[PDB]
Amino acid sequence: YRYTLPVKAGEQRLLGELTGAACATLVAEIAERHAGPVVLIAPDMQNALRLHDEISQFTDQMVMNLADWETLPYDSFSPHQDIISSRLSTLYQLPTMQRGVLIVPVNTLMQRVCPHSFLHGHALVMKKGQRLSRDALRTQLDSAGYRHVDQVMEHGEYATRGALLDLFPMGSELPYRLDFFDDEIDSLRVFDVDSQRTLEEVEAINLLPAHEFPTDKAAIELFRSQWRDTFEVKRDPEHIYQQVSKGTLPAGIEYWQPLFFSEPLPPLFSYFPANTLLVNTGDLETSAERFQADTLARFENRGVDPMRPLLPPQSLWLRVDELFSELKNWPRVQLKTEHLPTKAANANLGFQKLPDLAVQAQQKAPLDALRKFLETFDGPVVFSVESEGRREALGELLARIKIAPQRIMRLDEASDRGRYLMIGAAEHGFVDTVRNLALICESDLLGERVARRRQDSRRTINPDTLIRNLAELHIGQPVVHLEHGVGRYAGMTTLEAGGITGEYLMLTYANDAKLYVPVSSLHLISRYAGGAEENAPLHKLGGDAWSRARQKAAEKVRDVAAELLDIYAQRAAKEGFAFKHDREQYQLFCDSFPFETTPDQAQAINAVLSDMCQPLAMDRLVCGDVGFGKTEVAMRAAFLAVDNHKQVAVLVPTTLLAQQHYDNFRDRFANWPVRIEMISRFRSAKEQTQILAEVAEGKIDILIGTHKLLQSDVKFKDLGLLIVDEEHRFGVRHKERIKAMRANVDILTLTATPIPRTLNMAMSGMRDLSIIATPPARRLAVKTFVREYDSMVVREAILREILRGGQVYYLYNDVENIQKAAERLAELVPEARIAIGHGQMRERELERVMNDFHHQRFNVLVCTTIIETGIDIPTANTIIIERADHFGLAQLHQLRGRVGRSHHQAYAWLLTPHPKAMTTDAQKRLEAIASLEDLGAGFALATHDLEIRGAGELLGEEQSGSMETIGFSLYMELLENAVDALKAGREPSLEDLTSQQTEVELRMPSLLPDDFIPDVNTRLSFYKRIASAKTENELEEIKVELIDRFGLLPDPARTLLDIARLRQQAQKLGIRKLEGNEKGGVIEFAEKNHVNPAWLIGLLQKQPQHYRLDGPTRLKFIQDLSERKTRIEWVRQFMRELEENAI
Ligand SMILES: Nc1ncnc2c1ncn2[C@@H]1O[C@H](COP(=O)(O)OP(=O)(O)O)[C@@H](O)[C@H]1O
């Protein structure tokens, strides 16, 4: 083309006049036309990710990025070993590959690596036709460094179960099972982390060492030798020398890598193929050197703590001059967006930048510049769309500009006068003047719409995965056995206690008195919820305290049972309501919203709209973190409410945020004809009466106000929608007082963080719940600083935000000394313009200075906790508090996250009085809030607050209490028992808990042996599932799953399955208790059985000696069933024949 290609160690090519996103075009071109692999060096790893898209967007050659360590140099955490997988694979094949593009940032090119002899000297291949021992391969894996686990879920672990060994290779992404057979590899089956069954069988597998360093005995001794040669040992049970010598691995041990090879580690340059070409963008002569400075700076910063010392930086990272010399050994190309006219191997190819093409909604012709420029472009114009649906979203836009470009795949496909489009993540369009090509990106006109996972992958907390993290069976966590009391779970054990070895779950009580409970009676154990995992009560066994507490609870539930019998339903007398939504009308309202919702916001919208469309009323928690645009869900709910004209009301515990919602709703409905108004202290009673009259006649649909409505004064013609914000700070019977008016109203519970009782109820599932863990695009984190009382940090932070041009939120929490403090901090900060705010003011100047804050005429505001509700403006970007000894975690997090709603990094300066003046609980609160600082932190903080404040009375008042109440589920058990007492009118009795659906014990061992399943959690899960079976199809699929996950089925397993099947069939039949032994047994029916009495008596008289009706419902039979198989077959055929003549 316009230039040659550089192939020489010293050859350097330099290219200029290269606009943004044309670097990708040039890179793809040269890689496709370069006879050899391509390695690209990027200045910023994040930028490299961007490259990883656009390159793959424009070409089809395999493009990969060097997996890199996430942690900062000399950190105290592992590199998140999963990433290591993606690394090692690329390392293993790296020498042997001809075409392909590998992209690396300089910060990781700076890092030393393994010698690859260590790598491919340990690179095993397992093949079908191999007579290899299970144990030999086991020890082989152990030497390789794979970790022995029992429920493999991650990279680099292996588990065993009888003849079935399974593991996860470090190179591939899916684990594998083997199915050994006579020490022969019979199968090699891939299986998902959650299917635990075959997806397919592959002929052979290749596996790589577990880590980036050996871990055999030779490795340990070499490491110890190097250590004793270099550093100084400390005789200590956590000094990494002793910890390594023990056998384990320190968390950060990966940074002490050069102590494992007795060699200078390669600079990774040896791994380049014999014929490569370096291509470089930006510049390294600043990035690499600044990185070296940062590494040494952090090193010297942490040159303390003799336990866990640090290597010199030069031993692990390279030198800059050495890096330059090394790169001068390969041909290299450099790209920059400047003018280099001198002289050869240096060109300036026409890649003009995109002109100012954009769309303006206010203009009558948004695509004015677009249509002006399209017709002035003689060449083809090709658009790029980052997704699929958006393509149509822009095709309609092209219909507004009356053009239908054809979708192409490659840039060369463009004709002379051709308009086209393609799916790509390109950022900036441009004008390739070489052949007059116009490339257009979405941001060219749309602007900023970013949906990538900008946040760190590890920096995420899934709510459902947090519940599934564990809900049972932690070896120390407490549980409650309703018969006796509360203890700590300790595990499983098999016991021979009557000639049949049965499983038993063992609990421990006070004074170390153990209690084993049979596995079958599992439904008598509840997971503790009193929230005292470290200070919980420990009932001493055989005491009356638990019985007394249970009797008190029984009395309380009987009282509330009468109360519910007043309603004559289990909160079920309600029929609800159905809303009608017009999809086009709602879509029009979506159009009136000038934003794009996050995916979880869209999910919440779908859930709420569907639920209201259902003919039942809602009680739905939308508990997401602040700054997630929760209010817009309410806006759309109110729009659909006014579509039905259902007189929606809204509640908030303040006047500031009430006014905020008022103006927001006015903005949403300044185009839609509908009446929005407010009723609170600000309004005069003269107009409050008018508001009440208007809402009595129904001329008002949207009302915003505080507790004035729940004063038996407001009248609604048709109250159909009620909204509540910030459920916290609300006492009980507020919701009951607002519910009393109309039962079938849709309840929408908006909040930022639930109080412990509400959170526990959400966990119970009795109330609908929803979480939005998807922050807006530009909502970066909020910095937090827990500092002691310094008068200078506050002043300098105030000045830092003033020079930024923002507003400071000053918290002192006083209505007397706030006056003096305002002038005190004015003297401290003469540059500051301050207003005084407190809730004990006439509210006229309050709203006036709120308006002033909207205009930002004064910078820092002193206020009490009325600020907590929050009307945050994006201008405000910093909060300094004064009292940090008494504030709830919910308030702390809420005021932390209240700042932002903008692209600019906010701040949260936290001022504390003397540490010794702090009580223990204050220290715990402050250390907890400091420990967590990231997006999606409110929900996890609420989970932590659970077990701290403790869920309160699930029945009585005073929520969020840590009293000694019975757990959660037992309350529901007694409630349904009393509902039975009401429906059947039966007497209250503590016997329904002592339940018995069907007992089919026959003195025959039946259990899931631990050898057949290693762990206990899965064993108990299957125990519960089998106990709660409903049809023989369930049993069949369970048997299939057991076959998959654990191979063959032991005799006890088969017996358990068939006993469950027989219990199922007997429950279908109508018999309740079928018992027996070797010499015979008894059959006992129900009150209304379905066995034919005629033939029943016929059998009775046919063989009275072998059959005797001894009791109103008891049939005694004698049988010589010395074989378990004979016993089971006899009973099966007996019951089958009995039910054959079923009446
Ligand atoms: N997906 C989004 N992208 C950009 N900005 C958003 C998004 N969602 C919300 N916002 C902005 O952030 C602000 C959040 O205010 P609000 O609805 O009160 O959030 P929260 O109720 O969580 O405090 C809104 O005023 C809105 O303008």
Ligand code: BEF
């Ligand atoms: F209700 Be929010 F957090 F604005």
